[PDB]
Amino acid sequence: MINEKFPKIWYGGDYNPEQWDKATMEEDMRMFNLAGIDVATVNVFSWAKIQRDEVSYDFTWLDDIIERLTKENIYLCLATSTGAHPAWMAKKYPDVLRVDYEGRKRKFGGRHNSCPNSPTYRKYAKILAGKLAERYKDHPQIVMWHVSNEYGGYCYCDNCEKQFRVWLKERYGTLEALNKAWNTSFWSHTFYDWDEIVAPNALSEEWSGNRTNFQGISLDYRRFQSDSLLECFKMERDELKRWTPDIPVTTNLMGFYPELDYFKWAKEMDVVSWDNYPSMDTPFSFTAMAHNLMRGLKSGQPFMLMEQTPGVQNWQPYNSAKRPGVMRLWSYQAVAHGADTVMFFQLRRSVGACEKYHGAVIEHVGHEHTRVFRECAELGKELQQLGDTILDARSEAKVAVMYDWENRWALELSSGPSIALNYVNEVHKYYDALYKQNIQTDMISVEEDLSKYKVVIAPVMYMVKPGFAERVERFVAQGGTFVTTFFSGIVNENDLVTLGGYPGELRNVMGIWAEEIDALLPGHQNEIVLRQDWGGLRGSYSCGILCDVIHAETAEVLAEYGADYYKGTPVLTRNKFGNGQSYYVASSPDADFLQGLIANLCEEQGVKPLLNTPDGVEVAERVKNGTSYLFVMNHNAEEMTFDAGASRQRDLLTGKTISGQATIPARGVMILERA
Amino acid sequence: MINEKFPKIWYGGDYNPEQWDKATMEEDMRMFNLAGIDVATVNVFSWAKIQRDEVSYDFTWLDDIIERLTKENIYLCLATSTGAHPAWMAKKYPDVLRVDYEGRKRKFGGRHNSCPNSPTYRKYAKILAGKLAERYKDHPQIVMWHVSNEYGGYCYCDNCEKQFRVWLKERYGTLEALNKAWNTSFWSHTFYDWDEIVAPNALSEEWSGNRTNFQGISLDYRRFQSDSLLECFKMERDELKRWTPDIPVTTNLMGFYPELDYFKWAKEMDVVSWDNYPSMDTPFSFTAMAHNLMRGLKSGQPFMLMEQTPGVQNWQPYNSAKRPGVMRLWSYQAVAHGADTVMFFQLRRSVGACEKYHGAVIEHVGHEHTRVFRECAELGKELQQLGDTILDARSEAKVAVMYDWENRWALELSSGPSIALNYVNEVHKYYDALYKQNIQTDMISVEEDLSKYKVVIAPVMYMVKPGFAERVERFVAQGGTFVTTFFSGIVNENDLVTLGGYPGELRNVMGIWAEEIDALLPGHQNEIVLRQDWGGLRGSYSCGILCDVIHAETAEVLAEYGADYYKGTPVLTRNKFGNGQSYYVASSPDADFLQGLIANLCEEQGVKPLLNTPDGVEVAERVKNGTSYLFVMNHNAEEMTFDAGASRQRDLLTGKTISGQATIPARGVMILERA
Amino acid sequence: MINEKFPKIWYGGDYNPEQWDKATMEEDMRMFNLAGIDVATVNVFSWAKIQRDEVSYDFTWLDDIIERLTKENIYLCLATSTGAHPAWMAKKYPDVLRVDYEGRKRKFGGRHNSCPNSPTYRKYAKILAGKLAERYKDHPQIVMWHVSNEYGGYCYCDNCEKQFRVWLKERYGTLEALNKAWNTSFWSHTFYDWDEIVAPNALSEEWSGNRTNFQGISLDYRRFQSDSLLECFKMERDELKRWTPDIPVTTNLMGFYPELDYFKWAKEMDVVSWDNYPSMDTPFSFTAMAHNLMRGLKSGQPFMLMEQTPGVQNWQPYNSAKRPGVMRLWSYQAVAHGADTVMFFQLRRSVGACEKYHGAVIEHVGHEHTRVFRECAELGKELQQLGDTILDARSEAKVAVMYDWENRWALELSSGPSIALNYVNEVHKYYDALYKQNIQTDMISVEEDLSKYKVVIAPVMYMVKPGFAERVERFVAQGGTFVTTFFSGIVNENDLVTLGGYPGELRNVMGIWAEEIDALLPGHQNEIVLRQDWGGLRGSYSCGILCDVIHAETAEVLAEYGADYYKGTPVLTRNKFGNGQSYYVASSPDADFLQGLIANLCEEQGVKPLLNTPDGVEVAERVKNGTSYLFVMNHNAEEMTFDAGASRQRDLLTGKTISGQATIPARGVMILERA
Ligand SMILES: OC[C@H]1O[C@H](O)[C@H](O)[C@@H](O)[C@H]1O
Ligand SMILES: [Zn+2]
Ligand SMILES: [Zn+2]
Ligand SMILES: [Zn+2]
C-alpha cells in the first residue's frame, strides 16, 4: 500500500485553510466528513507565510491546521512549500529568478520558477524542508511528503550556463568527445574551451520555441535542465528522509509533460503522483494512456492521483463543466489504470486571484447543497465502501508500448522530415487501437525488461540507445513480436545518425532497409494495399504524414503502397526472426488498419480482449493475487449493454452478481471481481 | 454650446501648414472657404519645432499660422503639442521614454508614448502648455484647447514602478489591506514591504497580452496607469486655465478604447472629444454605440467629433474608400448621437511618412476638383445652413445600457470561464437590439443617476461596486425594470468574489441563485424554450457561449434550457421587486430572442419606437427645449421608404414638409423637426 | 566562359570532408567519378578549424583535401569560410555578434550573423581571405572564389547605429536635407543632431517585422544594412584579387530574397551565383522567374547555380522528395535561364546537427546504389556529353519585366493601401502570363538599357527614381510599348509622394490621371468590361485587390469597371506616345485577362511564342552566335506532344532529329538545336 496506516483509496486533496479564517475551517471539517474526505494536501504555497526573512520561521499557523485535521483523523499529505519563493527572496536574492527563453531576467511573480541552479534557492529550500521534517517527525497523521509543486520550465541564466558547462565536463570528459558528440565541424562550431559554450535559446541556437540549429546542444540542455530540477527534488527528499526515514516522498508530475524525463525522475521517488486535467476535447483513450504511463514510470507500481478538478478547470480555453457522473467516471478511470488515491485541486475555492474560477469540492456559495458537492460525496462513500480491496493490484498486460522523453526531445528538435509528425500522436494511434479492443497494455520505458510481454510496439523509435537493439533481438528471437515504424532507428543517444542504412541497429531484426522517406503535404494520403487477406486485414486502407520507401531484405511483404512513385513497394512487412516476428510499418495508417493489425498481432500471440464491449465502453484490469478486477467504464452518454461472460462475478460497486448480458448506465462504472 | 463664440456645428479639423510652405497656405485658405471650413486644429505635432533644447522656444511660426487663419475668420482649436516629445529630449532625457510590456527600454520613435511618471516629461510639458496659453491668452480666435493627443498605452519603467508603490500606499494604507485586497496568501505572494511589489508585465505576472496570475495586481496597475496619464492631462489643463480661465479644455478620446477609464477622465474635461474611424467592416450600430458612449461620459452633454477621415484611413488593413455619400452619412450619425462639431483628420494630406495615404479634404493633386472634396464641400454648406439649430440638443432616452472600464478590465484579465466571452460584444448585442427597433437609448456609467430611466440593462455586470446594489434596488422598487445576465454580481472592486452565492449583492433583487456556469465549446449552442407565450416571444431560440445554471427563488421562470444536463432549468426569469421588475438572462441569446425581449421590456414600461423603419434605416432623437429632432439615416445602398408619422414636420436638410409616407435616398439623411 | 580552364557545365557542389576522415574521402572520390562530379565547393564552414585564436592558423588539413581532389582532376570552388565565425571569437570579441530586431544582443550560435560593421569581424575576415589566397595563389585547380556564404539579415547594434549616422551624413549632407527627405515635421520628428537618430526596430519606429511609423528611416536603414554587408563582400574580394587577380570571385545569393539589393550587389561580383530551393508547393513559373532575375542582375550574363538539393531539403515544412526525373528537370530549368553550372548542397550528408536530413548525392547508407544517386549520375553523364555547347549562350528576349528592391522595400513598409498587396505576387502574375505562352522574357532592373526591348512591363512601379520617367518616355517615343499599373509613380527615392496627381512623373506618358485608389476587402472583386472585342480580349474578366479610379486624358479607353461606384470608368487604357504605346492596368486582373493582354501586346510588336506547347510544357531560349537552343521542359506527370516546327533541328540530349510533331516524356527535357 502507499501507506499501511491509511488502508483505502485516499480521498481529498489540496487544502488551503490559511487563505481563510478559523470559522470556515469548522465548516470545512463538517463538509469533509459529509463527503468522505480523509486526506488533505497542505502547505503547498506558503513559503512567505512561514519565512518572512533570511532568519525567521513561523510554523504556528501550520501546527493549528495539522492539529485541527488530526482531530478529524484526516491524514496529511504535507508539502514543503518550495513551489513558489517569497517576494522578499526574489527581491533580496535575484539569483533565485530565472532568465527565460527570450533571454530576459524575470522579476517576482507566478510560481514554479526558481532557478534550479540558484545558490539562494537551494540553500533555503533545503533548510525549509529540513525544518518541516524535524518539527513534525513524530506526528502520526503525515502519510506522504509532497516536495515542491510541479517542477518544470527551463532557465537560461548565468548560473545555469556555468553549470551546464560542468555537466558537460562530467558527461563528455574532453572537448574532443564533446565536439564529436555535437558534430561541431558543421557550421564552424568547433569549441576550444568550455566557456565558449552557451545555453541554447532565442539568443543563440534556438527560435520559435521548438527549432534549433544544433540539436545535440538543445538535447543536452534539456537533459541538463531536467537533471538540475531533479537535484532540487532529491535534495529536499534527502533532508526529509533524514528526519522521517519511514514517511514516503513524492512530487506531483504532469503526465505526458514534454520538458522533464520522468522515467529518470521516478527512480528518485518513493511513489509516482500526478495531476490529470482533461478537457471536454481530450480523447478518453489519451487520458488512459497517461494514467498508464504514470504506472509505467515505476514499472507497474501503483501511483497517486494527486490532483484533478471536481468540476471545471480555469486554465482551459473553455471552462466546460464535467457532466453528471463524469467526475466519478474519470476518477475510476484513474484507479482502473493504477491509481491508489483520488485527490482534487482543490477542497475549497480560492477568492482569490487566478484560480478563483477553478472548481473545488466546496465552492463560492459555501455549502454542500450543490450538484458538484453531491457527486463528490457519492464517490467518497463508495471509496469508503471499497476499503483496501483494490489496493496494490497490478497490471498483467502481455502487450507493451514504448515511450521515451529523450527520443521525443530529439524528434521535436529535429529539422525535418515533417512538421506534421507528432510523436505523442503516433504513439497514441497505436495505443488507441489496443484500448478500443480492451487489450490490457502497459506503457513502458525503452529500458523495461521485455520478458513478461508477448507484443512490444515502439512507434517512431527514432533514437536507439545502447543495449536497446540487443534486447529486442533477444525478445523477438525467443518468440516475441516487435513492431516499429517509419523513421525509427535513425540516430543514437547524441542525435548522431547511425550510418550504413536505416533502420541502423534494427536493420537486422526488422529484415528491411529503408532507402528514403517522403513527407506528404497536408491533406495528402497514400494507400496500404494488402497482398492478400490476412486475418482482420483486407483490401485497402489509407496512410499519411510520412511514407518510408523500403526494401524487403529478410522480411516478407504483407502490403504495398497503392500510389505515387513508390507504388507497389512495401509498406507493411513481417520478419521471421528466431522464434518470433517483427513488423515494420512504413507509414502512418488510419484507425481501421491499426485495428486489423493489432487484432492480428494479438491473435498471433494468443492475447485476447479482456471483454467485448460497444465502442466507448472501456475495460481495464488490475489483478490482486489471483483475483482479477475488470474496470468497465462507459464513456457514452447513453446506457450500454455487453456480455460479461459466464463466470461468477460481483460488481464491487453495487453488490449485485453479474453474468451474461449486463447493462451499464451512461457515464457508468462497474468493477467486476472474479478469479 | 461648446463655445458661445462659435454658434454652429464646427467644420474643419487637423491642420498642419508647418509641413508645407507659406505659399500653400494661400491655397488652403481658398479651398477652406470653398469647403465651408471654419475651424482648424493646429499645433498638434510640433513640440520639436517649437523647442529645440531645454531653454529655447520659437512660436513665431505659429504666430503666422494663427494670424493667417484669423484673417479668414477661421476659429482655432489649439493643441499643446505634447503628444510627441522631441528627439533631443528622448536622447538627453531617456526618463521620458517608456519601458514596454516585454520589459524593453524604448528608444526615440512613434508618438503618444512619453512615460506619464517622467520628471522631465512633466516638467517640459507643463512649461509648454503654460507658454502657449500665456502667449495667446488674449487672442479672439481660440475656441478650444486640445491637450496632447490620444493619451494611451502603458509604461513599465522604474519610475512607474516606484510610483505604483506610492499609489498603492495611498489606496490601501497598509500592507495588511493590500495583501488582503490582492489575496496574496495564494501562491505564497505575501508582501512584507512595498518594494517587493513589481509592475505586472511579461517579466512578472502577465503573458501574451491579457493573461495574468494575479488579476488584482493587474487590475490595479491599469487603474494606476490610467490615473498617471490623467494626471498629465490635468497638469496641462490647470496650467492652461491659469492664463485662460474661460477657454474650454478637452483632449481627444478613442471611444471603446480599452486601456483608459474614460468615465474617470471625463470628469476632468470641460467637454468630451473623440476620434471616429469605422472600417467598411464595422457594424453601423457599433459606431452608433460608440458616439452614444461619448455622450454618456458626461451624462448627456454634447461632445466634439474631433476626428474622422474624409475618405480612406491608412491604418485599416484594407484602405477601403468611403462610398459616395458615406462621409456625410457618418458625420450626421455622429451629430445624431450628440456631436456638436464635425472635424476631420486631416485638412491636407501629408507627404510624408506613415499617414501619406490617410485621406484629407485636400489631397495629393492639390486641388478641389475631386470626389472627396466635393462631398466635403457639400457637407460644409449644409452645416452652414443648419446654424445653431441642433446645438445643445439632448437625448431623452427612457432606456439605459451600462458599460464600465474596471468591469471590462477584470473580465479581460480573468482566467476563465471562457475565451469566447467578449464583454463589448455582449453589451453590443443588447444595444443592437434597441438600435434595430429605434428605441432611444443612453449608454451610461454604473454610477449614473437611474431615476430618469424606465429600463436599465447591465450586460455581464461581473464587478459590482460599492453603492451599486442599493442603487438598482431603489430603482426597481420604485417602478423601474432592471436586466442583467450570466456571470454578473461575481466580484467587488478588487476582483474578489462576493461569497454566499451568485449573483451576490444582486441576488436579492434578481430573485435567483446562480449555482454554476458552463462554458460551451465553439460551435455548440443551447436553446431558450419559452414556458408560455409572452409578448413577442414564442417557442424556442438559440443561446450560446455561457450557460448559467440557476434556481428561481423569488423570481418567476419565463423560459427554460432545452438541452444538456441543465435542460428544463431556468434561463429567463422575472422577479417582481417593489413596484418594478428585474430580468435575469442566464445565457447569451440570438438576435431574434433579444428582439422579442427588448420589445417586451419596452412595452411593459410604455416606451415606444421613435419611428418604424426598414432594416438599416437608423433613427435617433435629440431634443432642444420643446422640440424633437429625429435623425433618419439610411445605411442601405438603396432608396428606402417609411412612415414618418402624421405630425406636422419639416426636413431641415431640404426645407420640405414631410408627412405620412416618405422615401429617403441611398446613404441619405433626414433631420425631422417636430414637437 | 565562367572559367576557360573548365569548359563545360560544372557539376558538383558543397563538400565537407573535414566532417569525415580519409577513408570516407576515398569513397567520395570513387563515387564522384561514377556520378561525373567535377567541381567541389570546399571550406565554406571551417573558420574555427583553421583559426583557433587571434594568432594561430592551420591549413594543413585543407592542403590535403585540395591535393586529394586535384589527383582526381576535380576543380575547386574555394570558400573563404567567413560565413560563420568561431565560438572563441564570439566569446572574446562580442562586437562580432548582432543585436536583433527585438533589441537583444545575440550570443554564439547559428551562422550568417556577424555584425557587418564589426571591427573584429572585418579585421579577421580580411586576414583569413588574404592568407587563403596567398597560400593557394599558384594552385591550378581553383576556378572560383566563394566569399563567405549567403550574406543576409539585419543588425541593430551600437556600431551599426553609429555607422548609420555616418551613412546619412554621406547621403544627405545636412540635417536640413535629412529632415526634408524624411518629412520629419510629421509627428514632431525634427532632428537637431545626428546622434538623435536611432536604428528603426521594435524599440523605435517599427513593429511586427514589416510595419513602421517612418518609412523614410526604415527604407534608408535597409539600404544601409545592404550596403554594409556589401562592403564586407568587397573587402574580401579585394584581398583575394590582390593575390589571385585572374581567379573570379562570387558569393551565393538567394534569388528574390527581400533584404538585400542584389542589383547593387551584382555590380561588385564577377559572376552571379545562387541557391535554388523550390518546394513541392512553388509555382514552376516562379522558380523560372528567379533564375531569370539572376541572369538579369548582370544584364544577361550567365550565372552559377551554386546550390539546389539533389533530393529533399530539411528546411521545408514538409520534406517532400523530388519525384523521379524532377531533380533533372529543375537542373535544366536553371540552365535554360542562364545557368552555366549545376551544383548541389551537398555531396555527402552530415550526421550532424540541423542539416542531417538535407539531401545529398551520397547519403546515410553510404553507397551509390540508390534512386537519388542514379539520378545524379545520369545527369552527370549528360553534362559531360554536352561539353561546352551551351556555355555563354544568352537571352534575346524582346519582352522585359522590371523588378526593384528599393521599390519593394517602400511598398512593403507602406502603411496602406492594402495588406493584400504583394509586390512580388503582382510581378509574377505578369511573368506567368508570358511564361504560359513561351514568350522569351528578361527580368530587368529599372536602370537597364531599354533599347533592345519591344515591350517593357513594370508592375506596381510605386517608386520612380531619377532618370526613370525620362528613360521610359524615350523608350516609348522611339516605338516601344510600356506597361504599368495601379499604384505606380506615387513616390520618389525617399518615399515622398510626387504631388499634382498620380502617376506623377509617369502621368504624361501614361495619358491618364489616377484620382484615388480603392482597396477591396478579401473575397471582393470587380469586373473588367471590354469596350469592344480587341484581339484576344473580349467580354468580361475579373479583377481584384486594388482598383485605381482614373481619368483618360490623352489615352484611349479599352475597358471599364463593371461594378461599384466607379462602374463605367477606365480600367484599361492605351496611350499613343511618339511611335510607341503605353498601357495602364488600373486593377489586378485575373489570368485569362493577362493572357489576352500579353498576347495582344506581343502581336502588336510582332513578337511571337518560341513554340506552342501544352500547359506545363515550358519553353525558353538561349542563343550562342548564330545558334538557338530551345529548352523544352515538361513539368507534367504525363507524356506530352507538341509541334516542334518544321526546321532542321536535333535534340542535344538524345542526338535525334526532331521535326513537326514531337513527344516529350513526363518530367522530360529536350534541347532543340536550330538556327
Ligand atoms: O538548404 C540548405 C542550404 O541553405 C543554403 O543554400 C546554404 O547556403 C547551404 O549551406 C545550406 O545551408
Ligand atoms: Zn538558472
Ligand atoms: Zn513609466
Ligand atoms: Zn551591427
XYZ file of N, CA and C in Angstrom, chain B residues 334-384:
153
model
N -22.801 60.872 -36.160
C -22.131 61.447 -35.004
C -22.999 62.536 -34.392
N -23.466 63.469 -35.223
C -24.338 64.546 -34.741
C -25.624 64.011 -34.104
N -26.208 62.977 -34.718
C -27.441 62.375 -34.204
C -27.243 61.856 -32.783
N -26.026 61.420 -32.467
C -25.767 60.863 -31.141
C -25.086 61.834 -30.176
N -24.978 63.099 -30.579
C -24.533 64.136 -29.666
C -23.354 65.007 -30.063
N -22.782 64.802 -31.241
C -21.689 65.658 -31.685
C -22.207 67.052 -32.059
N -21.618 68.091 -31.454
C -21.879 69.491 -31.836
C -20.749 70.059 -32.712
N -19.854 69.192 -33.164
C -18.849 69.569 -34.155
C -18.619 68.395 -35.108
N -18.272 68.680 -36.359
C -17.748 67.632 -37.239
C -16.397 68.011 -37.852
N -15.364 67.317 -37.391
C -13.994 67.663 -37.718
C -13.225 66.434 -38.198
N -12.225 66.673 -39.047
C -11.506 65.621 -39.760
C -10.053 65.505 -39.334
N -9.493 64.314 -39.510
C -8.073 64.214 -39.796
C -7.974 63.813 -41.264
N -7.339 64.632 -42.109
C -6.825 65.961 -41.777
C -7.178 66.868 -42.964
N -6.761 68.129 -42.938
C -7.176 69.069 -43.988
C -6.361 68.994 -45.292
N -5.060 68.736 -45.189
C -4.244 68.430 -46.360
C -3.378 67.201 -46.092
N -3.365 66.272 -47.041
C -2.609 65.038 -46.865
C -1.129 65.321 -46.607
N -0.497 64.462 -45.803
C 0.946 64.517 -45.590
C 1.670 63.854 -46.768
N 2.995 63.905 -46.751
C 3.751 63.687 -47.975
C 4.719 62.482 -48.106
N 5.305 61.925 -47.041
C 5.153 62.349 -45.673
C 5.097 61.250 -44.616
N 5.937 60.212 -44.687
C 5.903 59.116 -43.678
C 4.601 58.288 -43.661
N 4.180 57.819 -42.477
C 3.163 56.751 -42.388
C 1.707 57.128 -42.690
N 1.358 58.404 -42.624
C -0.024 58.789 -42.924
C -0.229 59.496 -44.279
N 0.748 59.392 -45.178
C 0.604 59.971 -46.516
C -0.553 59.360 -47.306
N -0.984 58.155 -46.939
C -2.163 57.566 -47.582
C -3.412 57.564 -46.684
N -3.419 58.455 -45.695
C -4.629 58.780 -44.953
C -5.365 59.877 -45.721
N -6.683 59.745 -45.836
C -7.481 60.728 -46.553
C -7.441 62.110 -45.922
N -7.635 63.133 -46.749
C -7.745 64.511 -46.280
C -8.727 65.271 -47.175
N -9.140 66.465 -46.757
C -10.006 67.280 -47.604
C -9.270 67.613 -48.899
N -8.048 68.135 -48.761
C -7.208 68.446 -49.914
C -6.134 67.380 -50.013
N -5.988 66.781 -51.186
C -5.131 65.606 -51.298
C -3.988 65.783 -52.290
N -3.319 64.697 -52.643
C -2.078 64.842 -53.398
C -2.163 65.652 -54.728
N -3.324 65.701 -55.389
C -3.444 66.558 -56.578
C -3.324 68.037 -56.251
N -3.726 68.419 -55.044
C -3.595 69.797 -54.609
C -4.732 70.722 -55.020
N -5.839 70.165 -55.493
C -6.953 70.995 -55.919
C -8.312 70.436 -55.479
N -9.376 71.165 -55.795
C -10.695 70.886 -55.249
C -11.596 70.062 -56.165
N -11.108 69.742 -57.363
C -11.916 69.065 -58.376
C -11.813 67.556 -58.200
N -12.477 67.096 -57.149
C -12.216 65.808 -56.550
C -13.501 65.307 -55.898
N -13.796 64.027 -56.081
C -14.977 63.416 -55.465
C -15.013 63.701 -53.968
N -13.902 63.425 -53.294
C -13.847 63.598 -51.846
C -14.038 65.071 -51.466
N -13.399 65.970 -52.203
C -13.509 67.383 -51.886
C -14.948 67.881 -52.032
N -15.607 67.477 -53.113
C -16.994 67.861 -53.359
C -17.925 67.432 -52.236
N -17.785 66.186 -51.793
C -18.624 65.694 -50.708
C -18.367 66.490 -49.429
N -17.099 66.807 -49.164
C -16.748 67.646 -48.016
C -17.370 69.034 -48.140
N -17.199 69.653 -49.308
C -17.763 70.976 -49.560
C -19.283 70.968 -49.368
N -19.928 69.906 -49.848
C -21.382 69.780 -49.758
C -21.854 69.731 -48.304
N -21.168 68.933 -47.481
C -21.444 68.854 -46.039
C -21.257 70.214 -45.388
N -20.092 70.808 -45.630
C -19.775 72.127 -45.116
C -20.911 73.105 -45.323
N -21.441 73.151 -46.544
C -22.543 74.059 -46.862
C -23.813 73.771 -46.035
N -24.185 72.502 -45.906
C -25.342 72.138 -45.084
C -25.141 72.558 -43.628
N -23.917 72.405 -43.137
C -23.620 72.765 -41.756
C -23.767 74.273 -41.548
N -23.373 75.051 -42.550
C -23.605 76.499 -42.517
C -25.092 76.810 -42.402
